[PDB]
């Protein structure tokens, strides 16, 4: 429950319908129910899971940033006191965002990561674990911020170690992991040099491997490769 009575295949079917309807919260709940059936997910199913939550949390993070900006301006010299509402509502959004991150991190811990033995699945789930801890780090301000940052780092690092050993440098999961770990270095860990080095090296190694790819692989590696280039252009 609430998805326990629905067939696994029906939850998958509805997640795809929710995707087409851009109903990402429904899509995420259907995929959570599918994961809770206890069977490993296929490649396509892992992509549905990650798309659903990426979109839900993406909307919450964008909202949190809007409210945090407002809050920060209300705290500047000469700003009129408007009471607690900005902080209260930023906190409301923050708590819901944290709850989604905790839900995803719990699915990964119970029991996606432990049953994931192939590199494609293991690296994928570890990247998600890195991403959701990174989203927790974006709003963390307390006693726990360092440990949250280290949790993101550790998950990304293990993903990077496996992806380097087991996946070609053009593999889209390897390229996306490196893109996000580079963003983690730049904006969470205060390590813009490391972020730039990682994006550069990633991009360069992928470029040198493109010759091995079919026209279709070439297209999808080059897409993530453009996001690496976008960041390098922004950061340098």
């Amino acid at each position: 429950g609430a998805m326990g009575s629905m067939e696994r295949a029906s939850l998958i079917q509805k997640a795809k319908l929710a995707e087409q309807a851009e109903r990402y919260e429904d899509m995420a709940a259907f995929m959570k129910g599918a994961v809770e059936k206890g069977e490993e997910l296929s490649n396509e199913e892992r992509n549905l899971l990650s798309v659903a939550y990426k979109n839900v949390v993406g909307g919450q993070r964008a909202a949190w940033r809007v409210l945090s900006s407002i809050e920060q301006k209300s705290n500047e010299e000469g700003s009129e006191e408007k009471g607690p509402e900005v902080r209260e509502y930023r906190e409301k959004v923050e708590t819901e965002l944290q709850g989604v991150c905790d839900t995803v991190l719990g699915l990964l811990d119970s029991h996606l990561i432990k049953e994931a033995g192939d590199a494609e699945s293991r690296v994928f789930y570890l990247k998600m674990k890195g991403d959701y801890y990174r989203y927790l780090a974006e709003v963390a301000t307390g006693d726990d911020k360092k440990r949250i940052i280290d949790s993101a780092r550790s998950a990304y690092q293990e993903a990077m170690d496996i992806s380097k050993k087991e996946m070609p440098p053009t593999h889209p999961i390897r390229l996306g992991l490196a893109l996000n770990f580079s963003v983690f270095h730049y904006e969470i860990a205060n390590s813009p040099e490391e972020a730039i080095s990682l994006a550069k090296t990633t991009f360069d190694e992928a470029m040198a491997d493109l010759h091995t790819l079919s026209e279709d692989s070439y297209k999808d590696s080059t897409l993530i490769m453009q996001l690496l280039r976008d960041n390098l252009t922004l950061w340098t």
Binding site: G176, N180, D230
Partner: peptide, 6 residues
């Protein structure tokens, strides 16, 4: 204008 992630 905002850095990319995926």
């Amino acid at each position: 204008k905002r850095r990319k992630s995926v």
